[PDB]
C-alpha cells in the first residue's frame, strides 16, 4: 500500500526527540517519539518492526532516515498507520502505530502526500 493514502494519518511540523533500538520476536525494531516544534501538542510515538507486517521491506530505508532527522533537528512530517502492533506490553510502552514515512518539511509547505 502507498504511504499517503486516506487510511494513514499524518502529523506535520514534528521534531524527532528520542530513538530506541532493540529486538522483539526474533526481529529488530526501533521506535521514535516526536514533540511538535513549537512545544505545543502531544507526542506521537511510532515504531517499526523489521519483519512483522506489510511494512517490512521499508525498514532499512527508514531507520537510516529516522536517524538522520534526529541528528539535525529539522521539522519533519510523519505518516503512521493506526493499530498495527498486537504485542502484550509493546503496545502499552511506546505505541501501537507504524512508521511509514518521514516527509521533510519546509517553512510553509511540506513535501509529501496528505
Amino acid at each position: 500500500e502507498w504511504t499517503g493514502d486516506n487510511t494513514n494519518a499524518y502529523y506535520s511540523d514534528e521534531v524527532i526527540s528520542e530513538l530506541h533500538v532493540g529486538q522483539i520476536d526474533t526481529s529488530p525494531y526501533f521506535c521514535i517519539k516526536t514533540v511538535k516544534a513549537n512545544g505545543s501538542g502531544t507526542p506521537v510515538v511510532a515504531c517499526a518492526v523489521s519483519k512483522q507486517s506489510i511494512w517490512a521491506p521499508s525498514f532499512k530505508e527508514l531507520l537510516d532516515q529516522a536517524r538522520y532527522f534526529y541528528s539535525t533537528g529539522q521539522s519533519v512530517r510523519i505518516h503512521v498507520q493506526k493499530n498495527i502492533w498486537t504485542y502484550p506490553l509493546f503496545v502499552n510502552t511506546f505505541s501501537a502505530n507504524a512508521l511509514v514515512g518521514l516527509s521533510s518539511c519546509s517553512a510553509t509547505q511540506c513535501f509529501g502526500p496528505k
Epitope: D25, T26, I54, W85
Partner: antibody, heavy 119, light 108 residues
C-alpha cells in the same frame, strides 16, 4: 490456493490430530496467522492465534492447554496440534491471514476448511 | 468477554432495495468491528474493516457504518447474488467473539 488445511477426518473422544494449512504465495515470516472454527449450527468461533515468529501465542477461554498452535517458517505451515478432544469440536477449522499481518484488523482470504469429528 | 447481538436473523427483501443489518455490542467497542460474507457451502471474505473502511477489490455497493454500541452494514442496492451470511468481527480484546450471522432473502 495459498491454503490447503490438510489433516483430520475422525478421532475418538480423547485422541489428537495435526492440521497443516500450508501457504504458497505470500511472506509467511510476516502475516500473523490463526485458526477459526465453524460449528454444526453455522456459527464461527475463534480457536487460536500465532504471532510472526511464534514467540507470542493467544487462545480463548474455552481452549487452554488442549490446543497448541505452532509455526514452521521456511516451509509455510501452521500445525495446530489438538489434544483431549471432547464431544464438541466438530467443525471446519479454517485458517486465516490477518490482513496486513496485524491481528487487530481482520481476516484476509480464508482456506477451504477441513472436517474434524469426534464420535 | 464481549458478546455481539446480530438481530434480526433474517432479512426478506425484494431485489433492488437498501438493507441494513444490526450488530449491537454489549460493551463499547468504539470502531473495531468488521463484517464478512459466507455464501452457503463456502469460505467467508472480508467486506468492511473497522466498520468504516472498505477493502479494495470489493464492489462499492457495500457501505458499513456505526460507532459506540450500534454498528450496521448498509448494502445500498441488493442483488440476487448477495444471498449469503453476514457476520460480525470483534477485535477490542481477547477473545475475538464473532457474530450470529444474518441472511439476505430475496423473494419474487
Amino acid at each position: 490456493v495459498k491454503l490447503v488445511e490438510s489433516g483430520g477426518g475422525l478421532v475418538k473422544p480423547g485422541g489428537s490430530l495435526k492440521l497443516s494449512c500450508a501457504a504458497s504465495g505470500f511472506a509467511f515470516s510476516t502475516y500473523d496467522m490463526s485458526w477459526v472454527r465453524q460449528t454444526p449450527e453455522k456459527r464461527l468461533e475463534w480457536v487460536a492465534t500465532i504471532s510472526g515468529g511464534g514467540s507470542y501465542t493467544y487462545y480463548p477461554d474455552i481452549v487452554k492447554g488442549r490446543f497448541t498452535i505452532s509455526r514452521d517458517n521456511a516451509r509455510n505451515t501452521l500445525y495446530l496440534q489438538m489434544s483431549s478432544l471432547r464431544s464438541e469440536d466438530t467443525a471446519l477449522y479454517f485458517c486465516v491471514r490477518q490482513y496486513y499481518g496485524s491481528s487487530n484488523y481482520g481476516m484476509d482470504y480464508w482456506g477451504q476448511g477441513t472436517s474434524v469429528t469426534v464420535s | 468477554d464481549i458478546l455481539l447481538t446480530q438481530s434480526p436473523s433474517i432479512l426478506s427483501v425484494s431485489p433492488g432495495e437498501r438493507v441494513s443489518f444490526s450488530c449491537r455490542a454489549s460493551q463499547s467497542i468504539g470502531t473495531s468491528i468488521h463484517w464478512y460474507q459466507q455464501k452457503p457451502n463456502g469460505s467467508p471474505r472480508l467486506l468492511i474493516q473497522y466498520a468504516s473502511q472498505s477493502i479494495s477489490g470489493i464492489p462499492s455497493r457495500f457501505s458499513g457504518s456505526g460507532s459506540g454500541t450500534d454498528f450496521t452494514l448498509t448494502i445500498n442496492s441488493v442483488e440476487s447474488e448477495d444471498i449469503a451470511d453476514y457476520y460480525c468481527q470483534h477485535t477490542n480484546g481477547w477473545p475475538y467473539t464473532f457474530g450470529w450471522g444474518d441472511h439476505a432473502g430475496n423473494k419474487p
